[PDB]
Scaffold this active site. Structure first.
Site: not given
Ligand SMILES: COCCNS(=O)(=O)c1ccc(Nc2nccc(-c3sc(=O)n(C)c3C)n2)cc1
Length: 295
Positions: A11, A14, A78, A124, A128
């Protein structure tokens, strides 16, 4: 960093980039957010972020550690395996089963109930930022980070920030908005789960507001006392009539449509609280199903 071994970008949040990372002592996989500091790092951002380390709830993505060095801050979270945006895309053909929509809405409201009882706002919420796991949990991520800093309209990544989920009082330029903004964003997300289309896909601030107005009616002093005195309100706004919710989110049942209507009240003071939402009749038959997650 240093003890962390990047494994992939998950990701461009922002505030910074977000990597999947492997902690190189403990062997835990974590989400690492490098925060992109303006010059240094305000000490108040540091104290703001620090308080978050204690704001722990089953429905809040755990902040494991905050690690500071010069013009880079790192937040260590996490790791969960998927976000709701991707899960919704994955579910596009058949939609998310209503029992699972209901469970996710219930859990998030529990998360929000908690944060708001500690006077912490998300500001926010969006698909996502809502992260899911195989055991049927859903968690709020990226949480209380807006108060710690502020949210740029353009992230460091040159991707536009989405307005689709923004409460009208923010759009009408209210400075001191409340917990009710998160209830609004969550109703927009509820609606999107049900219908498999964004409710208000605004692509500028006025398109966003005029999309709200078209569906919900142009707000006036009858439905939103004080509205007409807000900073960015213009008497020249076009006056649209309200649509019925039967048309907005079919085929949501009456309980769900009634809860959604309360989550989408213009006046943030008439808008339902997270806590009151948890007692709505829509959650009388709540259950916790398992998603079909493809990792
Ligand atoms: C092709 O796949 C791209 C799409 N994104 S995804 O695979 O669904 C995805 C996979 C794993 C995660 N994991 C995750 N775990 C903990 C926190 C976070 C995020 S998302 C975000 O904006 N923040 C700040 C954080 C810490 N993301 C988040 C998104």
């Amino acid at each position: 960093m240093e003890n962390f071994q990047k494994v992939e970008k998950i990701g461009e949040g922002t505030y910074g980039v977000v990597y999947k990372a492997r902690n190189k002592l403990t062997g835990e996989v974590v989400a690492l957010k490098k925060i992109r500091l303006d010059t240094g790092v305000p000490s108040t951002a540091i104290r703001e972020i620090s308080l978050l380390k204690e704001l722990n709830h089953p429905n809040i993505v755990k902040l494991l550690d905050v690690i500071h060095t010069e013009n880079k801050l790192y937040l260590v979270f996490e790791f969960l395996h998927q976000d709701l945006k991707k899960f919704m895309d994955a579910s596009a053909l058949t939609g998310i089963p209503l029992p699972l929509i209901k469970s996710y809405l219930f859990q998030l409201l529990q998360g929000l109930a908690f944060c708001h009882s500690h006077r912490v706002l998300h500001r926010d919420l969006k698909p996502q930022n809502l992260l899911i796991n195989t055991e049927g949990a859903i968690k709020l991520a990226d949480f209380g980070l807006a108060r710690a800093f502020g949210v740029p309209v353009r992230t460091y990544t040159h991707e536009v920030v989405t307005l689709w989920y923004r409460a009208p009082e923010i759009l009408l330029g209210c400075k001191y908005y409340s917990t009710a903004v998160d209830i609004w964003s969550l109703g927009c997300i509820f609606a999107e789960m049900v219908t498999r289309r964004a409710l208000f896909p605004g692509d500028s601030e006025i398109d966003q507001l005029f999309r709200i107005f078209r569906t919900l009616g142009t707000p006036d002093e009858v439905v939103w006392p004080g509205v007409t005195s807000m900073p960015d309100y213009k008497p020249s706004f076009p006056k649209w009539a309200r649509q019925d919710f039967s048309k907005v989110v079919p085929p949501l049942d009456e309980d769900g449509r009634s809860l959604l209507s309360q989550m989408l009240h213009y006046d943030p003071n008439k808008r339902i609280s997270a806590k009151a939402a948890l007692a709505h009749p829509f959650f009388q038959d709540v259950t916790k199903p398992v998603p079909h997650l493809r990792l």
